[PDB]
Symmetry: C2
């Protein structure tokens, strides 16, 4: 408790000097979890990012500097087993690590041999999907996004459907196609409905888009038939990643009535590799937007349940040397919180499991430079985006690399998410 609070102290610094870079994502205050391997050891194992390096948790446990309840949960291809140990475990590990990485601590700092083994450069590492995802659910909880999208489908006056302000609507996504940052994404072929022709055609998607989102990861499940209350919801959440829900919008338009988006979504979803713990995000909790009408009782919660997470997306054409930023927004603008989303997810009795992934829905902000999709940013191509380094984009083109990035900004430091990147491959011919 008091130990947990010390790990959030902005004044703390690490003897890993790169960790003290004021704009770096991996401050000693962060300590996110991932799954890595390296050139010396291709076995996947649990790692914690610090500065430009990674702490090998299995190595620290073997040396006796790190203990979890008693096979090692740190020698695993996924974080599931360690997450399943519960929140007391996550915090114990976080406090031990924070102590050991602290500049005033000598236990690991001054052990050159163990430090030469237990700390690995990210430049030497392979980062893998951090969890084995039992289920992936995606919501739609940005009022600005639903307004922007709905305005094109109807008009500003009728942008929002009545159920949208009564529930955090969502759908099951495809867990199998969630891939880690860096995985190339192939432009899908599919059925396209052209405005001139009576019957659909088969061809390459012409409206390939991102969806800027976050995903939170379930740390404690719930039994089938047993809802999670809104007040209890956040205690079930382990942490967060960045999430790009790649969308083929022309494929979506033709297939989606009435059972929802399907092939247009499931060809690829990318997440960042580092799970930033919900505890690490506590210093950035802020007041969520005001809801009108007041939702039904089961969706209500007192206090603050939004999080101040700066988000950015860059797009780099294949021939470009530098990427151009195409949007900047914040997770704090979402109309429905994670607590409310999970509460609604389970209100009818659906169960959840450790490692489940819950996408926020496209995060769109107040200003025209803060929308979370090219569909919004270019208003369906009516005003193509002029790229800072050169070129124009309506939707994504072949060889474009799309990079999501995110951080919480504190006083003199950051708690950041790394990157969620993918580069588009030409459709199959």
């Amino acid at each position: 408790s008091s130990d947990l609070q010390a790990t959030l102290d902005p004044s703390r610094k690490s003897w890993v000097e790169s960790a003290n870079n004021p704009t770096g994502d991996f401050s000693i205050q962060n300590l996110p979890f991932g799954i890595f391997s390296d050139g010396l050891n291709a076995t996947r194992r649990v790692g914690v990012a610090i500065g430009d390096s990674i702490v090998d948790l299995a190595a620290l446990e073997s040396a006796g500097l790190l203990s979890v309840p008693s096979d090692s949960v740190f020698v695993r291809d996924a974080l599931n087993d360690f997450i399943a140990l519960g929140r007391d475990a996550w915090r114990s590990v976080r406090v031990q690590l924070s102590r050991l990485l602290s500049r005033d601590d000598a236990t690991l700092r001054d052990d050159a041999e163990l430090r030469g083994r237990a700390l690995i450069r990210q430049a030497d590492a392979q980062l893998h999907l951090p969890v084995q995802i039992p289920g992936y659910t995606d919501f739609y909880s940005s009022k600005e996004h639903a307004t922007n999208v709905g305005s094109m489908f109807r008009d500003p006056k009728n942008a929002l459907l009545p159920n949208w302000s009564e529930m955090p609507i969502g759908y099951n996504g495809r867990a199998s196609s969630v891939v880690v940052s860096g995985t190339p994404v192939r432009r899908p072929n599919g059925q396209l409905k052209l405005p001139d022709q009576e019957r659909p055609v088969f061809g390459a998607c012409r409206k390939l888009d991102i969806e800027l989102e976050t995903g939170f990861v379930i740390g404690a499940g719930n039994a089938l038939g047993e809802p999670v209350t809104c007040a209890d919801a956040e205690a079930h959440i382990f942490g967060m990643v960045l999430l790009n829900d790649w969308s083929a919008r022309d494929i979506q338009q033709w297939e989606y009535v009435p059972l929802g988006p399907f092939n247009a979504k499931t060809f690829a979803t990318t997440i960042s590799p580092w799970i930033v713990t919900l505890d690490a995000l506590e210093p950035f909790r802020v007041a969520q937007p005001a809801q009108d009408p007041q939702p039904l009782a089961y969706l209500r919660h007192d206090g603050e349940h939004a999080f101040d997470i700066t988000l950015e997306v860059t797009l780099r054409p294949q021939q470009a040397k530098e990427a151009s930023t195409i949007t900047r927004t914040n997770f704090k603008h979402m109309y429905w919180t994670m607590a409310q989303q999970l509460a609604h997810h389970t209100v009818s009795g659906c169960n959840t499991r450790v490692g489940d992934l819950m996408g926020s829905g496209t995060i769109s902000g107040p200003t025209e430079d803060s929308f979370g999709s090219l569909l919004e940013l270019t208003w369906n191509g009516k005003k193509p985006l002029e790229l800072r380094e050169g070129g124009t984009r309506s939707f994504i083109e072949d060889g474009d690399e799309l990079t999501l990035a995110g951080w919480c900004q504190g006083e003199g430091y950051r708690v950041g998410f790394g990157v969620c990147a993918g580069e588009i491959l030409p459709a199959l011919k």
Copy 2:
């Protein structure tokens, strides 16, 4: 080849006499795969149904009478076995069919092994047969889609319905094995008289009579499965009840599809009937008009003749009422077409994935696959042949899906897919 064809011969019979029952599901021609434990060994392991008994595959492998490429038969799920591929499935099938044949004494007369390796179903507990990585549900009955659509339009079918096998991602986590009771969901309801929705018990709880097919070989992300290769990716089939809360669905589902109204429970039968065992019952699928795009086309026959029936029994009622009888052969889109369309944009599939057919409604009014259709949204409640009436499912009701392939004096059947409805939380 010759070896496999001998396992389909309707003339073959077992020394497990109950398997020779003409109306039994677990003939020697079936040999479906499941996961069981029993009173003597609580460890979950791979079993094959024969008559009223279960062949303990791990016990035979230990006894030397069974071989495959820790044993894949000592698992809580069929996934690792299925992952060995179709040669291994057929190998096991041929070996078991021989060992269970009326005249083979290798297993029949080894009493110390047979006492351990043949377990009565009555002394055994059956579990969910696979660890499901993904669950997809389709919508491929023209009769079903017509009846549903006919409730909002005259143009009952939308255009895209006849051009693709539309489907949606389901919730893998709430797929439960037959016999698991299902709690009626609470959710948001849109009442006709009130502007804002209310929270309360679901009032239109329904079944959806389906089958599910289980993937036996996946495909890489970005690499579609062609329609002509689709069936070689399919291990087997189960019965599937996609429980549905229709008033919850109507309010939530635009535009992202059904969600809370479906994910509270989906029941499957425990015995996976292999596609090989189903081969004698392959039949011609319905004629499609218009002709689909080329990637959805296949020559030959790709439907399967599967009798399906659903009973409803009120709580403490002695006799169940059969409320519908249909057949899988009526589905407009085949399993091959569903899998082709599922992957055509590059979605990947994994061993153990579950693919529901959608509600199976036939042409006649007594073959519809949901109470929504059988009662026309409650406008004509149905009279339980044993007494009482139903619009939608009431608390305590037990809904049982059953099914079999009818051969000449024998059956290749699926067992049952049952659940009793528990009251909603209060």
